[PDB]
Structures are given as structure tokens and as C-alpha cells.
């Protein structure tokens, strides 16, 4: 599923991401844009046996277990497959575990490099929520 930005913003807010650890909602929508381009089925293999899954591209070496990654930690205690649904619940839940403090969004490279420093609020203005 490819979310529209407003549609995704409303969902993330309903799931408690608006101002989570002090991160305004736009940061999460912006992160999704650059990580998965809003595609809930987005998948991407990296040089290391790691693969990132879902709207927020959760990593299989540290956060979710996919079974094909050496050195898996599975810190979110969840199957990577569980993160490829139209329902963003599992991905947000894992995202909330990843961001344990006010600097946590650095967990997403795209966010640090393409969202931080930009008007992330622009991704949500005009969205009914």
C-alpha cells in the first residue's frame, strides 16, 4: 500500500507518533517518504546480510528477525514479515522501541540526512488531523 502523506500522517498520529519523544509528526512522515516513499511493502537489501522492511524500513540485523540475517538481534521482538502490512501498527510499535530518547530518529539515515534541518511540518500542513 502506497499512502498519501495526509493519510499516513493521520495514521501515525492516531498511533501516538505526534510529538513522540518530542519529535513533531512531520519528522515521521518525512522519514517514511525518504525511507519507503510511503510504500508499506518497501524492502531493501544492504551490502551486509541486512534487509530493511516496511513503511519505516526496519533493519533485520538489529530490530526484526527475518531469518536470513547473520547476527540478528531482533530488538523489537517481531518477525520482519509482520512489518509489511497496510496496517502500520507493528512498524510504529517497533519504531517507538527504536526511538527511546530525543535523538532516536537518527536511527533512520534518510531522516538525519534528508529530513532534519528541513521543514518537516510541510509534509503535514493542510492534512485534516
Amino acid at each position: 500500500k502506497v499512502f498519501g502523506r495526509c493519510e499516513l500522517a493521520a495514521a501515525m498520529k492516531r498511533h501516538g507518533l505526534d510529538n513522540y519523544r518530542g519529535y513533531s509528526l512531520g519528522n515521521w512522515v518525512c522519514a517514511a517518504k525518504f525511507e519507503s516513499n510511503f510504500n508499506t511493502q518497501a524492502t531493501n537489501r544492504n551490502t551486509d546480510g541486512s534487509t530493511d522492511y516496511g513503511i519505516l524500513q526496519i533493519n533485520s540485523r538489529w530490530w526484526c528477525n527475518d531469518g536470513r540475517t547473520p547476527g540478528s538481534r531482533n530488538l523489537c521482538n517481531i518477525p520482519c514479515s509482520a512489518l509489511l502490512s497496510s496496517d502500520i501498527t507493528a512498524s510504529v510499535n517497533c519504531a517507538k522501541k527504536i526511538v527511546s530518547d530525543g535523538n532516536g530518529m537518527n536511527a533512520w539515515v534518510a531522516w538525519r540526512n534528508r529530513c532534519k534541518g528541513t521543514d518537516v511540518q510541510a509534509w503535514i500542513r493542510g492534512c485534516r488531523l
Epitope: 510529538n19 513533531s24 519528522n27 538525519r112 534541518g117 528541513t118 521543514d119 511540518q121 500542513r125
Partner: antibody, heavy 110, light 107 residues
């Protein structure tokens, strides 16, 4: 250790410098705010981490904000100075829609 | 542009008392409202952001609330260090603006 310090002409095309440290200008916005003697705060404008700028609607034609990421400096330029521009000028770091650290400011008299 | 109307202009109160400052915006600012405190001869300092979140180190007696176009800052059992000035500021899109300020002074 996040710090910001204004540097200005003192009296006067105006030119004030905001020297920062403790963070990268590529990751945060820097706002310019002024406060006339014994008055309230007035927003002047800002330069986002990505270089974009926005200005006070009424003062836009007289303001120019720019920066040099490599020297951790942000600049405020204001021309057509008038008595009404006399005030303390502040630069402040914006972190995700709140000005979290402010410089001590620098007083200017036109 | 969005304009903020802050009231009252001043407040005379005594330590222990509870006071409320309001800030209403001519347009919906979607909770993007912050509050700052400013002591005489000092730079403004962040107190609350995104309507209800206290900045690090700010005592819990400070509480912010609001939504849409109306907001307020409340100080329960205000203390000596609370006296000084307060300003609200919105962050809804760019032309940002501040409220007119409130001087909280000792009764």
C-alpha cells in the same frame, strides 16, 4: 554546549553575525528575533538547516538572511534602517519548532 | 498572516498563587505554540513547546494547554523565580509571530 553569540555594528545597510557552536547549522534552523527597548519580541526571519529562508512579511523587502555552514555563522542584513529598528537583536536555534537556545543578543541603535 | 493576541498585559500576584496567561491565534496553529519566559536583562528561555510539553528543567507547576486557535499557560503556586515576562510564539508555517507579552509581577 550549544551556544550562539550575536556580533553587530552597534550603531548605523545593517549587518549582524550569529556565531554558533555545539551543533551543525545543517541540522537546525536559526531564527532572528528583535526586541525594542522595554518592548516585546518581534520575529524577523529564519534560515532552515537546508538553507531555505523565510521572513517577517512586513520587513521582508529589507531583510536578507544567509549563512556559512563551514564557519558556523549566520548573518542578518537589514537595509533602510530607521529609528524603529533600534532594539536588541537575537539569533536563536530552532529545534523542531521551538527556539531552544538563544544568544545573549546585541543592542543596535539606528 | 497569523496574529497572536496574548492577555493580560500584566499580572500582579503573590508566591503560592495560581495564574493563567492566554494566547489566541487569528488562525488555527495546530498545537504549534511555544511559551518563553524572560527575566529582566536576560534572553528569553524556552518553557513549553508544542502546546503542552515542558522544556528540560522546567518545573511541573508550569502547564500548557490548548488546541486550534486558543491556548494558555498556567503556573500553579508560582514561585519567586517565576516573576518576569512571558511570550507565546506560533510555528504554524513560516511567518512566525509572538504574542504581545505578559509581565508577571509581585503583588
Amino acid at each position: 554546549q550549544v551556544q550562539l553569540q550575536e556580533s553587530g555594528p552597534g550603531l548605523v545597510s545593517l549587518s549582524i553575525t550569529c556565531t554558533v557552536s555545539g551543533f551543525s547549522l545543517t541540522g537546525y534552523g536559526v531564527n532572528w528575533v528583535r526586541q525594542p527597548p522595554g518592548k516585546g519580541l518581534e520575529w524577523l526571519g529564519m534560515i532552515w538547516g537546508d538553507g531555505n529562508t523565510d521572513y517577517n512579511s512586513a520587513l521582508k523587502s529589507r531583510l536578507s538572511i544567509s549563512k556559512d555552514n563551514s564557519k558556523s555563522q549566520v548573518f542578518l542584513k537589514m537595509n533602510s534602517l530607521h529609528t524603529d529598528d533600534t532594539a536588541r537583536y537575537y539569533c536563536a536555534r530552532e529545534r523542531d519548532y521551538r527556539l531552544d537556545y538563544w544568544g545573549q543578543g546585541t543592542t543596535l541603535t539606528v | 498572516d497569523i496574529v497572536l493576541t496574548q492577555s493580560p498585559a500584566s499580572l500582579s500576584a503573590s508566591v503560592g498563587e495560581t495564574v493563567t496567561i492566554t494566547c489566541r491565534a487569528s488562525g488555527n496553529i495546530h498545537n504549534y505554540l511555544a511559551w518563553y519566559q524572560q527575566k529582566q536583562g536576560k534572553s528569553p528561555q524556552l518553557l513549553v513547546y508544542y502546546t503542552t510539553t515542558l522544556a528540560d528543567g522546567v518545573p511541573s507547576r508550569f502547564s500548557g494547554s490548548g488546541s486550534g486557535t486558543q491556548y494558555s499557560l498556567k503556573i500553579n503556586s508560582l514561585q519567586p523565580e517565576d516573576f518576569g515576562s512571558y511570550y507565546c510564539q506560533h510555528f504554524s508555517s513560516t511567518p512566525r509571530t509572538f504574542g504581545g507579552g505578559t509581565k508577571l509581577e509581585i503583588k
